[PDB]
Paper text:
A major factor that limits the expansion of shrimp cultures is, however, infectious diseases from viruses, such as P. vannamei nodavirus (PvNV) and M. rosenbergii nodavirus (MrNV), which have inflicted heavy economic losses. The Nodaviridae genome comprises two single-stranded positive-sense RNA that encode the capsid protein for viral capsid assembly, the RNA polymerase for RNA replication, and the B2 protein for host RNA interference suppressor. While the shell domains (S-domains) of PvNV and MrNV contain conserved sequences of 62% identity, the protrusion domains (P-domains) and N-arms show low sequence identities of only 17% and 43%, respectively.
The structure of a virion-sized T = 3 PvNV-LP was determined by cryo-EM at 3.5 Å resolution. The icosahedral asymmetric unit (iASU) within the T = 3 PvNV-LP contains three capsid proteins occupying inequivalent sites with somewhat different conformations, which will be henceforth referred to as A–C subunits. The cryo-EM map allowed modeling of residues 64−368 for subunits A and B, and residues 31−368 for subunit C. Thus, the T = 3 shell exists as slightly different dimeric capsomeres consisting of an asymmetric A/B and a symmetric C/C dimers with the bent and flat conformations, respectively. In the T = 3 PvNV-LP, the ordered linkers from the C/C dimer exhibit a parallel structure at the opposite side, whereas the linkers from the A/B dimer adopt another new structural feature with a cross conformation. Remarkably, one iASU of the T = 3 PvNV-LP contains three sets of two Ca2+ ions, located at the interfaces between subunit pairs, which are coordinated with side chains of Asp146, Asp148 and Asp151 that form a 146DxDxxD151 motif at the E–F loop, Glu118 at the C–D loop, and Asn250 beside the linker from the neighboring subunit. Furthermore, residues 47–55 of the N-arms from subunits C5, C6, and C8 are engaged with hydrogen bonds to form a β-annulus structure around the I3 axis. Our cryo-EM map of the recombinant T = 3 PvNV-LP contain some information about the icosahedral-averaged endogenous RNA structure.
Author numbering:
A (entry chain C), B (entry chain C): 31 to 53
C (entry chain C): 54 to 263
D (entry chain B), E (entry chain B), F (entry chain A): 66 to 368
G (entry chain A): 159 to 211
H (entry chain C): 107 to 158
I (entry chain C): 212 to 263
The structure:
Amino acid sequence: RRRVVINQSNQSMPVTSNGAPLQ
Amino acid sequence: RRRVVINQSNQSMPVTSNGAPLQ
Amino acid sequence: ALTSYSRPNVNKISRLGPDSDFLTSVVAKASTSIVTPADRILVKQPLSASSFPGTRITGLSSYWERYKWLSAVARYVPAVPNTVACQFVMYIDTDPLDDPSNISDDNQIVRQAVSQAGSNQFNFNTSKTVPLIVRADNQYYYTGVDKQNLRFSLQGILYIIQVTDLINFNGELITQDLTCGSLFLDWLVNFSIPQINPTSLTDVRVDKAV
Amino acid sequence: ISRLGPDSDFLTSVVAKASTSIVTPADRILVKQPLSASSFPGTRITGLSSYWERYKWLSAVARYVPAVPNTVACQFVMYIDTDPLDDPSNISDDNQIVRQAVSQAGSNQFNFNTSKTVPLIVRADNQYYYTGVDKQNLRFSLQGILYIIQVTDLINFNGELITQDLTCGSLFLDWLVNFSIPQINPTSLTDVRVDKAVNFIKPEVSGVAEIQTVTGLSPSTSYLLTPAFLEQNFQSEAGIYILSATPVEGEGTISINMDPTVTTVSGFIKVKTDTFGTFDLSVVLTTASKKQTTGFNIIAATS
Amino acid sequence: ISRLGPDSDFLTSVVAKASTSIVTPADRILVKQPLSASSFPGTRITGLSSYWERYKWLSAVARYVPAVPNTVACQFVMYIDTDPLDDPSNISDDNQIVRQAVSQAGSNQFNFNTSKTVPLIVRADNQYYYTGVDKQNLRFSLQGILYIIQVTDLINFNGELITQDLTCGSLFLDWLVNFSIPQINPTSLTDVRVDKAVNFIKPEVSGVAEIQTVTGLSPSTSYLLTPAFLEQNFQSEAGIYILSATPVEGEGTISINMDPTVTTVSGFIKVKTDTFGTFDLSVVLTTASKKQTTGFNIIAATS
Amino acid sequence: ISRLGPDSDFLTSVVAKASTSIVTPADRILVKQPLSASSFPGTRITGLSSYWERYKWLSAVARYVPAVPNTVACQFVMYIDTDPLDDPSNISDDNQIVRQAVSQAGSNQFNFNTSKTVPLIVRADNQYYYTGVDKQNLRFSLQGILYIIQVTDLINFNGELITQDLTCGSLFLDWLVNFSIPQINPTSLTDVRVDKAVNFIKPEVSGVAEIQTVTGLSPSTSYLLTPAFLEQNFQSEAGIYILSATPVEGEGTISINMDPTVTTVSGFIKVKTDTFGTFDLSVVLTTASKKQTTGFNIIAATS
Amino acid sequence: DNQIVRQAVSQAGSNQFNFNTSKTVPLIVRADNQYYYTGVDKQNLRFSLQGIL
Amino acid sequence: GTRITGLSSYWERYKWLSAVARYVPAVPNTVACQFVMYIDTDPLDDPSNISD
Amino acid sequence: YIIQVTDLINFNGELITQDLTCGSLFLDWLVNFSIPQINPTSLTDVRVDKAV
Ligand SMILES: [Ca+2]
Ligand SMILES: [Ca+2]
Ligand SMILES: [Ca+2]
Ligand SMILES: [Ca+2]
Ligand SMILES: [Ca+2]
Ligand SMILES: [Ca+2]
Ligand SMILES: [Ca+2]
Ligand SMILES: [Ca+2]
Ligand SMILES: [Ca+2]
Ligand SMILES: [Ca+2]
Ligand SMILES: [Ca+2]
């Protein structure tokens, strides 16, 4: 047989964006 | 916070017993 | 353009198990080889999660910070017939710095073993189990290789003590040191705070020129 | 009211005896083990027993395991005599001593190749028994006496009788006690033992103390040091063998004065090891040319 | 049970380093700041930490601000190692030390032109850590170690590398603690400093004490006074430079005896200022014609 | 607000004085101890007082224990004057100064070989007195002043007058506070003190740096080193006594240059110890044949 | 000599007495639940001692 | 150094189902250079021996 | 791969004269893993292979 276990040994890293004006 | 993920990155090893007679 | 990659504040506790692993073999010995009482110690196995190199649990242990054995029962399997006989006593001492190896009495080392909680006494041609006794309080232990103190990173030490001369079918003494069986663990852990654990990195370098 | 247990404690190792070692019917009693709590020195139940006056076993099931192959054969009968004064040793018939065994309630017979147990029969009333060593009457301090009677000649696989006294198993106790009246019980239930013997070093300079560091002992335990020397010709050359040993930590002076006018072989050193199982003491000789070895004995309490 | 917070405390100023100052991969660790409460001397959390034994951060989010223009560029990664003994300093590859960073949970990377934070990951159990200086094992007294790793060469607006070690921001802590067991922690976590040096006055009359009033110091704090003089030819004329300085309030005698037969440059004055930051002391010279200047150092504890 | 307590502290010792030392009724005031939070340097309430703006004693009871045998007798009265500018130090009648004492609320009257307590009576309104060291008006930052008036001459076992003043007991404050508005509250109260005065080593070969390890100090605490000497002839033979001490880890120099053309005694060292309370520094002499001893003070913040 | 006794009286549960008077001193327990180990001393002295008198 | 390389040697084989690599700059809008970023699927195609 | 196609220019349109680190690379991944095995090269072990 083969089985597909959803492994739960990870962790996320969400990306946020911004940006400064000249003044 | 703390969370408890059931990690599914293992595998079993079941133990069976027997034993031979003298004859 | 400002960008960031902040990981969240969560602590995932990954409960692995139950799986089974191999610890070591065990070498019973003759009465000729037993001189000091500390010769009767057959195995001295640390039971950290990072203490069995080769198993996957030691591989995976250095990718979290701490562990705790929830269920840990070590299951002795013999490899010998019913024609040779010697009596073992198997236990898991919970203090990793209590060492029986500096006891000058041969009867005291085997009363050291049977009086530990969870010990199981057996003829070594019979398969028996020994359960780990968990602490009353909730203590975690650091993974990885051992630092300054064993009491931060070892939850127990498996011992097997020999209490009787290794006898044969004819009631005579065996004259050789004889390997006799194996030890398998049946475990169940938590793991908290994933970290790469910098001693796990394979790297060849020269430390110090002395 | 201080209820402790259930636990496990190793009583003794049982030694089955050969056919030539059995002469009288009294010689079939392999073990005669009193089941007072203060009667298994070194174990956990006896160490606890010296810190209360009274006790009572709620459940004392004695668990025997074999240490012998299944290819040899002998047969045991095993019981717990609730009266500590009923002595089966004066029975002149060989079969009557084993009918004495199976008639006692709670008894058990077994082949000695397997693991069987004997429970302790409770009393009808509520009587507590005393701990400590047995002072005057055994009926105050002993709840039972465990017996194991050999009923069969010890055979081997080869169809022969074993000619040697053979250790054939072990006795373990699964115990559950009450206690009362916390105290100390003035007689100590421990035994001392000469741990090891190692000689004094030979200092090179006369009248200057060089420090002898000894290793290999147990960490952070107290020891006692008494001198002992065997077959040394101190008059093989000139001079007088005068030794003085003092610890840098403990208390005491070992003095060896082999002047045949005034002989003084006396003194004792009380010192405890460090965290590494080592200690050190100041060894000095008045005549350093006299290289006759002198030893000392390391006394320690084992249990 | 003594819960205090939430507040704010300045840890350190972070100094980004030039490209020539980066040689080994260990040299990318800008700050290695232990996050024990007793590890930020002078701040409010460390002053409080010396008055309880144990603590535990309930929320220790470390808030970085920039002190740099938006026209220069570099990139940081920042984390809190919960194990205080996992040391990233022995990693011989330059990319492996920053993969060590982002793999730790609760980590964060950012451009150093903006304000980002790193929270402290709580344990799974309830363990308290000790305050005070780190005695033997770091795993008892440190909850985390804050790291900041430089992953990028420090560029400027003009497309060039900065050649100087540049202070690039500040680290603040938003903390919330428990405590227990009120006490004092015998090692003082303060540092002393020579506050200023000012010379003794030159009295006009031999053997008559004129009082020197000094100003400019902090009000109502205790100071320590020790003499220090540099390159004075006392034998340029006749006489012996003998000084005696005593406070009119405190305790101590500074004595300067430049007689080359018996030299005595010794003593110390403990005195505290008034409400106006001034104090005064009796300066007297045996030979007032000797106008060689002699100074003293004002010692004070700053934090 | 932060409500800390209840806890204990140490105020002072109290020295009861004899008949001859009491000449005016103003001499009967044994202690004039302000019971502000910020007036007991080194204690626990004073160290906490510099981390908040304002305090208020909820329950602050001062306790007295005797350090005196039961064969001397002297009646005390003890009160906490809530007005800090009411001053009993200028009352001409010896009975009026004790009627002024016993009429204060919460005062207590005891023989001085008997342990008793005195409670501070709180205000009817809700005033938060300021923390920190004193300023212009003394009614903003003090909640009370503790006084102990000696009301009877000190006596012996036989009823005759004691002729010497006697330190007799100690005062302990059992307190409970509110605090508000965390500040770091400048002009800190940590007084510095000479820890010990230890002298340099006398090396053999001139122009060589050697390591002098000084032991027995506090572990991991920062110190301050100032040079000193006492009564030395630096011209006893040929050569100019030049010394230079530099640490191997710390910062600064010490210079002992007794050149009669330019004499320099200056410099200081800030160095901290290891975990063993030890440190080391590099001593060099230009003429090591000249064995004039030279010291150095060790300045340390005591609390 | 005064700082060593201010360090003493500020400990929780300390007691101040003339030495011809019987008194008591209570040990203040931890806020968490730590079980210190029994037996003789080892490497670290914070694993097996709850207090020093 | 990453946990994925640590955990990769506790299984035999892998396959990237989703793999998107996300370039983050650390530079202002005042310097300029043009990159091109790709993931070649053949690990033996090497552009390092191109003379143009 | 990351290929550079243009000269590294500044704000003034002039060439940068230094080699300049410029940013980072993060992966956003999703894998399978089949057949758990300890993978014998993962074992940390110090030994001498071959004397040449
Ligand atoms: Ca143990
Ligand atoms: Ca670790
Ligand atoms: Ca008794
Ligand atoms: Ca009977
Ligand atoms: Ca008794
Ligand atoms: Ca402490
Ligand atoms: Ca770590
Ligand atoms: Ca303390
Ligand atoms: Ca203020
Ligand atoms: Ca132990
Ligand atoms: Ca390709």
